[PDB]
Amino acid sequence: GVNEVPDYHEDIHTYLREMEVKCKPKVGYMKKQPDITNSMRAILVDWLVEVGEEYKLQNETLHLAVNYIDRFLSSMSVLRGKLQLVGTAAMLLASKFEEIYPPEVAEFVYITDDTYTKKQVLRMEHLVLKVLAFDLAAPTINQFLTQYFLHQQPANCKVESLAMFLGELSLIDADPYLKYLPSVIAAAAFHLALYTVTGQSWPESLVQKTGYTLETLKPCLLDLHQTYLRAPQHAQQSIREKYKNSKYHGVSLLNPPETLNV
């Protein structure tokens, strides 16, 4: 019914496909960043995962923030001592965009262990707004995922949570996910989740909507499968800890499949 906007879902999907390309970060920004690394960004994003669970933020908010950070770092060189200030202003802006009840600025200053002042956060907020030119309505993995979920027959909450979990893992590692569009990571996450839980595959109905086949998804699928296998060992663990919660059907406890047959 109307909550799935039958008369607009196609128009919206098409429009998001266009926008994700305009909201895409530069795949090779870390090499041009003298003083920060993929590893530091991993720490930042993992932290943001924890900030979101402490303030009970939407996942969409987390994804937006990451988008803002990646786009910011695509044009703005940042010292490692300031990476957290960027991330905090990002999370503030995403919250104001997406949350019914955003945390106050004070709450954002608090989560930084007084590393930064309120004045610094608000000034960075302005800076990030300038750099993004107020272009904040960015498509996320989640926005694609929730549409793909409508093609399950029947709906499975384990599939849905597991797909969300995998999509979130991908936020952590610029290499290799900065090279893939949200719509494609969502597609890979959805197939991997579906395959893991029910043994089924990316459905023809989603081939009809996306134009994506297992063939076009294969590169991202191979990456995401490795990420899933190696996730217990990864230096960053906040997403796994989060996805133990029954809110998310404890999906981080599911075993990855050993092979994909793809």
Binding site: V2, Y8, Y15, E125, L129
Partner: protein, 300 residues
């Protein structure tokens, strides 16, 4: 932001929201007449307001002849300036200037057709307006009407998640919001446009409640108190009460007497209780009511 305040000449105040004032201004170099919205910053000491972040982000992406145009944004540390295209009046002031004249049917039909165009464009770009009312609809001398005041708008996902409950001016608020439904969708903007449609014909608000329960009661007394048959799930809704008086649906020709059969058909479908059965802006564009539609200039 090719904008810079120096090139604007103030003309007169034209409006004030919570987050500032609007002035008619004139671009000294091009001649263009604009509306400048000043957003005051840190007046809450919380940075750039969420309303402004949403209005700018969404209005930058929404380029439609029936959606107000954000021409530029001036970003100063202490002040944010939004540069809009200027329109001479809102629909509330025109309906009030049209007191004892009425609005001619071709003009009502033109305005409703354009409103639905602008709204469909919003919904196709995953934007809910969530404050359609005559005050927020701008008209020009060429016969255009445009959705304005995106201060409560929101980018939605598919399917929708739970969003803010305190949405839509009361007289224009859909029953599903009044009943505290977990989810609401594009249908809430159509409800608003339905109320507006009726109001263009009569020049009086269709459901002028003075409280949430009075708003519902007035709706129920016009359209009948909804049951499981007309609206499955209604009796389970958070703020549904079994004790609700059960009013009969009055024949729809009595709700807006001067309206013709096509108009009544269209109106009925905009004010359908069940949000799933309520017509979409996209489908409404094809309704027979509009068969003979044109775009005349306003009569005043």
């Amino acid at each position: 932001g090719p904008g810079s305040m120096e090139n604007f000449q103030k003309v007169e105040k034209i409006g004030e929201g919570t987050y500032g004032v609007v002035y008619k201004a004139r671009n000294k170099l091009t001649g263009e007449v604009v509306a400048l919205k000043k957003i005051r910053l840190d007046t809450e000491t919380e940075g750039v307001p969420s309303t402004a972040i949403r209005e700018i982000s969404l209005l930058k992406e929404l380029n439609h002849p029936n959606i107000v145009k954000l021409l530029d944004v001036i970003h100063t540390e202490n002040k944010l300036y939004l540069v809009f295209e200027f329109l001479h009046q809102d629909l509330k002031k025109f309906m009030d200037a049209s007191a004892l004249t009425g609005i001619p049917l071709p003009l009502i039909k033109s305005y409703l057709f354009q409103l639905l165009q602008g709204l469909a464009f919003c919904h196709s770009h995953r934007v809910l307006h969530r404050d359609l009312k005559p005050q927020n609809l701008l008209i020009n001398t060429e016969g255009a009407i445009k959705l304005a005041d995106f201060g409560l708008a929101r980018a939605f996902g598919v399917p929708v998640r739970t969003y803010t409950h305190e949405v839509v001016t009361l007289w224009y608020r859909a029953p599903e919001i009044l009943l505290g439904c977990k989810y609401y969708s594009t249908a809430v903007d159509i409800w608003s446009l339905g109320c507006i449609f009726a109001e263009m014909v009569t020049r009086r608000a269709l459901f002028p409640g003075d409280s949430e329960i009075d708003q519902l009661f007035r709706i129920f007394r016009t359209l009948g108190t909804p049951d499981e048959v007309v609206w499955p799930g209604v009796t389970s809704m958070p703020d549904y009460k079994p004790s609700f008086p059960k009013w009969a649906r009055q024949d729809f020709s009595k709700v807006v007497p001067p309206l013709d059969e096509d108009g009544r058909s269209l109106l009925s479908q905009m004010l359908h209780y069940d949000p799933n059965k309520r017509i979409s802006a996209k489908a409404a564009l094809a309704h027979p009511f509009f068969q003979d539609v044109t775009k005349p200039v306003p009569h005043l």
